Amino acid sequence: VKFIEMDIRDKEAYELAKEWFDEVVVSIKFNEEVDKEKLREARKEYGKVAILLSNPKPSLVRDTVQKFKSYLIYVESNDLRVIRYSIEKGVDAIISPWVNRKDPGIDHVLAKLMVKKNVALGFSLRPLLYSNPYERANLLRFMMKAWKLVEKYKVRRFLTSSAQEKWDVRYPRDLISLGVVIGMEIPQAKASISMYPEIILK
């Protein structure tokens, strides 16, 4: 089986993940404008790079999906309006929408739209690692609820470290264990780091 890490956000984490996965995608964060040159080099260098829009305005999302068609586009936002809109615009993935929210960041209506628009939901490990015991428990609760919805409607999904440091990276074995903890069966967790990433990449 070919395991894939869809979201690495640090150079040293990338080098380590490359030793453990068949393919690693590096996410380049942008908040106001997407820089073609900053991306261009990443492609030649890393090969596979995703544009990560962090708390973007709707206009930024629209522009990006139009201009950069050959790039994967991920959206991280805690604004339900932006999340819904990004899904409608057909971005490739919504990453951990429950972060900085008091709910899963996804519901029945949104899950249905995600499947229709072929948008994936990315489950990040990082938040759990950086949180204290109490915060971790709340995050897990929201992640579990998000998983049940994703499973119920067959929404594409993937597990990822979303690593910012070398020590945030995890071997497939341990990402699978994360999947089980949030409620996935072993095969589902395995598919979340192989089959689904393959479908998302095409």
Q: How many Cα atoms sit within 13 Å of 69 on the Cβ side?
A: 2
Give the residue from 153, 67, 80, 166 showing the smallest Cα distance to 118: 153
Contacts of 153 (CB under 8 A, 6+ apart): 108, 111, 112, 114, 115
Give the C-alpha separation, 150 to 107, whole Å.
9
1-202 homologous superfamily: Metal-dependent hydrolases (3.20.20.140)
Single-letter amino acid code for the residue at 22: D
Would you say 65 and 90 are in contact if contact means Cβ atoms under 8 Å apart? yes
* Burial label, 177 (beta-carbon count in 10 A; 0-12, 13-18, 19+): middle
Q: Which two tokens stand for residue 22?
A: 């068949």
Would you say 82 and 57 are in contact if contact means Cβ atoms under 8 Å apart? yes
CA gyration radius, the chain = 15
Q: Where are the domains of the chain?
A: 1-202
Centre a 10 Å sphere on the Cβ of residue 23 and count the other Cβ atoms it contains.
Answer: 16
Give the C-alpha separation, 6 to 24, whole Å.
6
Contacts of 55 (CB under 8 A, 6+ apart): 31, 76, 77, 78, 79, 82
- Please state, in angstroms and as integers, the Cα–Cα distance from residue 75 to each residue in 42, 111, 132, 190, following that order: 19, 15, 25, 23
Q: Which approach determined this entry?
A: X-ray
Q: How many Cα atoms sit within 13 Å of 115 on the Cβ side?
A: 12
List, as one string, the DSSP characters of 54-118: ES--HHHHHHHHHH-SSSEEEEE-S-HHHHHHHHHHT-SEEE-TTTTSSS-S--HHHHHHHHHTT
Single-letter amino acid code for the residue at 82: V
Q: Output the CA torsion 162→166→172→176 (10° steps).
A: -50
